[PDB]
Amino acid sequence: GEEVEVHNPADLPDPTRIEEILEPYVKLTIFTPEEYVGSLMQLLQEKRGRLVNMNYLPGAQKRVELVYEAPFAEIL
């Protein structure tokens, strides 16, 4: 089954019999103005966030909204 490598990376279960280590991810939404977007994406890349979605709220003209699934630990 499953349980949590708690406040002790040392106190694992035996990585002998192991198949899935799970990070906490998070639904991460970024309201940038204009195409700082270019900067933003490079940042979220090395933070290992998957790009799921982006949407322009037009009007003038900057405003872009980015949605990301990213490992919770990679913020903090």
């Binding site: 195409e35 977007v37 790009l51 982006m54 322009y56 037009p58 009007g59 003209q61 872009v64």
Partner: protein, 139 residues
């Protein structure tokens, strides 16, 4: 109400949903996003699939207008003898092989794109995409 940007880009006849670059460039827009899908993946589907871009024009009251063509000479050669890469190490690698007229059909489709309305200069054309994936011209 976005300006009149001249929309030269590089998209694919099939791979079509609002993941980038469908979004960033077509931000300055307001068009029916799933139309390069719809009309382009359907009306030019006889050839197969693959990459062809699209030339839209945005006008301020959210107006689209686009025309396109033919999957890339490196696709029309992937149906040929069964490839989906090149040959990694060509110049000597003769994986698939074609005849001087089994590579005369492939320009029946990409003919209206170069400047050669002669399917000799349009044969060695698509047969040049051969070498950079290694498929040969027999004897």
């Amino acid at each position: 109400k976005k300006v009149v940007a001249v929309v030269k880009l590089q998209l694919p006849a099939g791979k079509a949903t609002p993941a980038p670059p469908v979004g960033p460039a077509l931000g300055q827009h307001g068009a029916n996003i799933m139309e390069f899908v719809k009309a382009f993946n359907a009306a030019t589907a006889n050839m197969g699939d693959a990459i062809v871009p699209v030339e839209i024009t945005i006008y301020a009251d959210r107006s689209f207008t686009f025309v396109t063509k033919t999957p890339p000479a490196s696709y029309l050669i992937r149906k040929a003898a069964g490839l989906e890469k090149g040959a990694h190490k060509p110049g000597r690698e003769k994986v698939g092989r074609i005849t001087w007229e089994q590579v005369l059909e492939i320009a029946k489709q990409k003919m209206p794109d170069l400047n050669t309305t002669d399917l000799e200069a349009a044969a060695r054309m698509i047969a040049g995409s051969a070498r950079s994936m290694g498929v040969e011209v027999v004897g």
